[PDB]
Design brief:
Chain lengths: 437, 455
Amino acid sequence: NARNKIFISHAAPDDNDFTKWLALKLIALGYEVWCDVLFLDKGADFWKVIDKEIREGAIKFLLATSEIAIKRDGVLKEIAVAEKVKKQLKDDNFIIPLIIDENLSYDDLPPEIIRLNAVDFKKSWAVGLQDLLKALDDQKVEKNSPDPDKSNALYQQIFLHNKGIIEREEIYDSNWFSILSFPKELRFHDYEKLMPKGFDVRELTYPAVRYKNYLCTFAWEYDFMHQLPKTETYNSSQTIRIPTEEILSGKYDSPFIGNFECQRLIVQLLNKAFELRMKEKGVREYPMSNKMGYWFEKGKLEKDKFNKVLLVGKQKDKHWHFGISAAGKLYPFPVLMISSHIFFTKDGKELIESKKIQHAARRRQGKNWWNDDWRNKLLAFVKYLSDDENSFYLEVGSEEKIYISNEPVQFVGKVSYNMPEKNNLKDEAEISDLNDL
Amino acid sequence: MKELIYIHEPNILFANGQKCADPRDGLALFGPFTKIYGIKSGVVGTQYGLSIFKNYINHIQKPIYNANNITRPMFPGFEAVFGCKWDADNVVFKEVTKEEIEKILYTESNHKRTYDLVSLFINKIITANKNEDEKVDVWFLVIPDEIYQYCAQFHDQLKARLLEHTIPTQILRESTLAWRDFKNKFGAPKRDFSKIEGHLAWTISTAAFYKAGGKPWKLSDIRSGVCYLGLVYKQIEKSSNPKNACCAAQMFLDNGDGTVFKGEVGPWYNQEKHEFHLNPKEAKALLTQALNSYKEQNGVFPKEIFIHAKTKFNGQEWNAFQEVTPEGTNLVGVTITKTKPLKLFKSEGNYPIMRGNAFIVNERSAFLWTVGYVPKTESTLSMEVPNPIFIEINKGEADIEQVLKDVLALTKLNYNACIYADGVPVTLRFADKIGEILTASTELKAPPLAFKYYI
């Protein structure tokens, strides 16, 4: 009821930013302030409070003056009430227009406030502040000790009411796909003495890696006999066997080979197995520098869709295909880690040679796609990679296979955010494009 | 299930002890942590460029709104935000005549074009600095966007040849200040800053306020006596020994201003590992420089020192660094990578995972989402799925949660660009830039300078 809360009337959204700034600035000085922005629960009685306030608690009536806000009937309604009180208060300088519009013409001001003294913030907010502050002090307005603590409290509580985090569990999908089982034994073979010099281990049907004087694989002793006939004379006793579970647990260290060395070798075998399986799976290949990507041709899938998810489409005069690449990782958990790329083709079959065009189109198409697009496209591809309901397999041996689940490893968090009311993602993409330019 | 943890966003401190998480909001509401009396300007460009600068400076004195004022807050005004007048009246002007620029561009080799251009701007700034008593706080190089387009970059060589003389410098393009005046063949601006017009000013303003001796913000609740050092390596391309590589130390306290310590150009780059590794001698030299600078600034040796690196650490350089570390000083080696491919997708919504989420792999390694979705700005720092950075405690004993909190904390520090936050911590954010600055001129022996002379 005391006139200590300086009343600031303005257009709810048009003068919102200016008011919110001026309100908190004034508060920091210790000036008590009343405006609609400092308020959260405003319904259909707030005007009654606005009244009880303009008439009972207002040592001043500073009003943002703008063409848009001077056209608003509510603004004129507040003006009329403030005049009525100004006459009762005999303050005259009670109502203090704060002209904030460059193109505002003074004649458009209402005849009620056409002759009053107005602090100008059109030239600048800071310069208008000093003049506003000077007028307030000359009006001997009462102010408490400066408190930016109160302004900070008002800011976070009101300005960030529904812009924070919520303690709500969120389950996330990943690109890590769990590996359900491994072949029981990892076998090293002394094929060298029976292997032609200069032979390539990558050419081997099944995954096999050269290490020291040994060939490492999960395969049986007699599977490369087709490629290496001399292995028909190989002796099984020369083969060195390690239980793979002890390899995953890291409980096997031997003078023959270290745990880390054998784990890297298992990773290499896994990658080669995935490349071979993908070669078998009918997808096309994009030879990346470090890994190999796999993408669908146009018309290979049903309507270029799997699981009702578009994996092949058109961008301008280019055909984008969602491709994946895979790597292995034994720690922290045995997982195949699929990566997602977009590969472009002139017609859907011939990849565009220029890496620069590939990169530009990839960046643009990735800008277009949001969280769902990426997640659903990656899931669809692996769901298509499936050989049964729950997994697919990589052929490491004639009797030995590696089973990878087609559902990615999921991560649970204890915090989440609330979805925005307005989706401005396209504008954000355009703005980020300008940031690049 | 594979549980995650949330690292709460760290607040930054502003004027009057006010802690807020958004630099734009904090600067607009309370003002910078330390305020300067004013920003004396020096412009280094053509008359057209000078008019562009003056008009922009006069125009950012008046409120500039953003099309989206939730993702990017509007700029209240230079005087309204900072509290000092960046007037265009008190501005020294070095007028590069068009003839000088075109005559230099005539050169066939850009190496020379940039050098000759950088040389001209250096001379114009120095003569003005030394010969007169004009205490110009910041020298603004309003170079035509063309100069940047043609000129190995202008930024790095200019920053190095000013590093010689230790004077602050900010570079701007005519397009950046006056984008409306530059249009394509269709009557539209080459770059439409219409919806970010309020963002751009923010950036520029904060940059200027940093280079004129002001501290926009500083971290709020950092523990006492903690020093963050980020090694910066970059191989000299022209060196006969392909192992010759520059080194550098990036001392960051809670304040976030930063100090750069140059090191000796030596055979650090290992080609077969692709990892840079320095001998015990230079390790001891660099960490002695950092410790001595910290002691002379703060009066005591750090109680903890974290040497953030983009690669791994050997035993010898760590035992070297360890030899020059006082007992009380806990030397921690943290490797931060942005390569490991782990992507978390959200089950519902076109919006990605929140920033601050983290996967703790083990007691000494963890994934941290420094890129993500910010509820406050209702936007994302990257239009692509967030790629988490892998933080590993390579050497020394620490706590991984504290390391992740510190990494997020360091990321907030970014005066160069006003944004809720950045993806890389400041210790490694400008690692490549500072490296390029250093290899631009390695002969000059810089004393330990600050980022005000690097970024």
